[PDB]
């Protein structure tokens, strides 16, 4: 076990049922039960990609002391860092996969992340039932370098929807609407429940785009949302870009296509295809 | 009961189906003569315009495209307000502006009349089938009285507490889902790049607030409780949000609202919130709209 | 001359006031000017009985239709042989469907709108920005130079609001832009002053309208000098030390956004000025070059 | 002097062109041999690598896309410090992250090299004309020894006032121009969707804040002065851009800075700036980045 951060610290303290550059980390987790990296599992859980490289293949490095007989990076980096490093290992005779985790702290001390397992389909087997304590679900990403994929992907949403999230909830207590009478409607549609498995499925993923709700109508909506806000100065970065989002749709011609299709325009707009 | 409908359109005509189908009796108005025969075949009386669909009706139903038409429905020439009763209640089901809601249910209680304000969620299948979403706003007394006809229209009505709290929790509701909508597809569009089948992203997101959101997941018992200690920390969510945003520029997938959310974390980081709950991004928008820190 | 004015705000009072000042006979009415000379009005009909020039400075084109067409409106009091000057700041589309609307009628309405501040109205140094025909600009000149130092031709009705909005658009998220800038130079520690004497010599400084745009995209001309590749690098260089700098810049943010999705179309290697020809593409416009 | 040139990219070219015009001998390197073929015509030393480049070379000079390739030319594999003297002066002239900057010029200082960033404003037009904006970092001693060489490239030098100092004012300069190219093109995309010819836009831009910039007009005597007594208050300035964006929007002309732009003014509303002058966004930036109010 390489790293006793925030998520590092209570995994390890589920294993025990080590080395860190804090020596205060090391005291903790040897009143629970190394100077540098005879293990069977190397398992890294460090803040970037540059640390990961510095303990596996630096001055007194994993590489040095590690045994041909899986490396798990369980760390949120950079997707093409961690394929360089499964192919540097793989170039060495090593083998090394990326699983690293869905949830917070608070499911890393209970056990209960959601474990994102990158790497060979038969390798997911060989480190599963270590990782399989750590959390209480598992997901086969599909290949090396999935992990970390689904990783930033899941991530990406979650962080940024909490900026929306934010813009939507002062709007509401802007208007004096209690957030209970919000928080209930949105979990009754896309806006709690998200696009993803209600109004994607069956239109724009099944390459339909005959309206449901139409992008113009959408458009429209977010004027309104946007004249509130500004006459109540709430401000809404998020909002005023997704306007001009829609506002591309609308130029390309989508505006009377149902609201699915900007995933489309945003596909168009990063030079890909239909 | 005796029903004026005036808006005909892809959720006003099987609306006003639905409330014929339950054996009330319409006068409906539209611009368009062939969405008033649609309705007219189906047993409506037709009007010439709101007025005359408002004679001697005990409820006024308007389905418009915008708070302008409502009150050119409402108070212009040959409008409802020239045949209204002080007895009827007019119901407006339109998406329009909350202040423009607000105004119209002044305006029409300033001259003896009743208005609530009940939006709908969902699309028009659900109003083919009666299943929509009712966002009942108005007075309690006026939810009782109209809660019968709004249930031949809709399965479900929430009472949103009040005069005008309809349309807000509509606004509310598709500010969110709209704007959500453009960075769903951001996330989707960085999945695709990566080339990471989107189904396995689905399968993840549904597992955390990615796929089931903050609001009843990481907000309740932090930032909704005054609690502001970290289970993922905003400087950890900002870092993450830029190995994204560096992936997206490397791979040339616009995304705006991810790049606007990041200048949000480092206002919050500025501010010194880097080491509380990213739920404390609520406080931060609270404090940049000018209102008194929780 | 006898004039109708409707709008006694922070800028139609002393504008009215310069008119009264030039010896012009003033009829003026306002929602809430005598003692300098006019003659009070009951609504705008009064005000407008046998003028020759109607003026309006209104907050809005919902005010200015409901001054022109309402009750006792101008529309009520004007003379065919007479000229609407809007000098108001609304939407351009108001503006035409109001020119429009007017001369459905056989009035006359020209959109003579003004840069500069309240200040300037004082002084009657405003930038007048005049819209409508070269006839009616030739008709209204020596009546709007009372109350404006400069006169621009837009060329054309609607064109003087048109050219108001472009300036204001341009000038206030510029002022928010510069704000970004100026604090990135403030939290790296280098003197403002020093930042500002480079820009002055590069298009931060100088603007790309009238320095890289005219020889390369306003030419047709994409082969780069300035790579869009290199731009979409050094705007990431910016945003990562803004951000560790806790700098907010979501113009930047967005900035960066724009050249990606140059980069998405195939524009990497062109000059940077075909971010413009991206932005036309964007808009749904037939591509120049 | 004998120089090396390490990059002879569209600003490289033309730099190494106007040393060896200027009577210099110059080791040219870089990975596309016609570059180097090109130089060796105008008189130019072609070298295998860096490491020869720097052999007895008074002066190395890097123009490269970025500060990992000119980290991987000084001290990657027959790197410039495998040829490089005690006695040299190494001069980065690239646009790289600053604190890569300050990391290899330190990384050089322990190992007893002298390194100094000298970035150049102006595009490769100016390159070649030798017309380059010359932003010196370095030491004052390191800028007067540099002087000469540089002077053969740029009409102009700026002494940015210390190590690292040239890269910083060059970032400040390309974010200022690089973002402003984004916004020019929506005012001039919004002015061809409203049929209004550009050159009259720009006749009226050019007497303003618009074509003038406000960093020499409406800053120094409000906001640089501690004024914020209104000549263009912010309230209406939020306005204007609000009828902007609806224009742009209802003409489908997505204008994302603009968009962000308002979001700040509303911000500035919020913190009780609306009466202010508009100049006064400088100190709400200020705020949201922590700083003390001015
Ligand atoms: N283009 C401008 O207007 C301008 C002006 C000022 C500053 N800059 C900055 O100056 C630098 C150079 O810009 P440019 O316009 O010359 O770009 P360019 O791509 O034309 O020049 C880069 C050159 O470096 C070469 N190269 C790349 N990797 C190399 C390596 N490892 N060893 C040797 N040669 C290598 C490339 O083949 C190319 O010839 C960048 O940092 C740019 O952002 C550009
Ligand atoms: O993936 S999420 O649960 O949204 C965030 C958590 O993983 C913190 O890293
Ligand atoms: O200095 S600017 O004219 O802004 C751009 C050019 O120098 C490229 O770096």
Known sequence: FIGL????????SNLLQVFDVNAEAVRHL?????????????????????????????????????????????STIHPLQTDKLIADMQAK???????????????????????????????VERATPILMAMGSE??????????????????????????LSAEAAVLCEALNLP???????????????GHFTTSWPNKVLSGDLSPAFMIDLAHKDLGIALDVANQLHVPMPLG???????????AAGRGRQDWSAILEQVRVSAGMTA
């Open 138 to 163: 598992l997901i086969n990403a599909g290949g090396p370098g999935m992990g970390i994929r689904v990783k930033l992907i899941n991530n990406y949403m979650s962080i940024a929807l909490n900026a």
């Open 179 to 193: 957030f209970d009478v919000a928080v209930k409607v949105m979990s009754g549609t896309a806006a709690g429940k």
């Open 5 to 12: 951060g925030q998520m590092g610290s209570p995994m390890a």
């Open 240 to 250: 005023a870009a997704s306007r001009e989002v829609y506002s591309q749709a609308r």
């Open 93 to 123: 005779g090593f083998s090394m996969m990326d699983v690293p985790v869905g949830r917070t702290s608070a499911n890393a001390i209970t056990g209960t992340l959601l474990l994102l397992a990158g790497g060979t389909a038969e390798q």
């Open 30 to 74: 040897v009143d629970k039960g190394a100077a540098n990296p005879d293990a069977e599992f190397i398992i890294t859980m460090l803040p970037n990609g540059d640390l990961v490289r510095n303990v596996l293949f630096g001055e007194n490095g994993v590489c040095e002391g590690l045994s041909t007989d899986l490396v798990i990076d369980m």
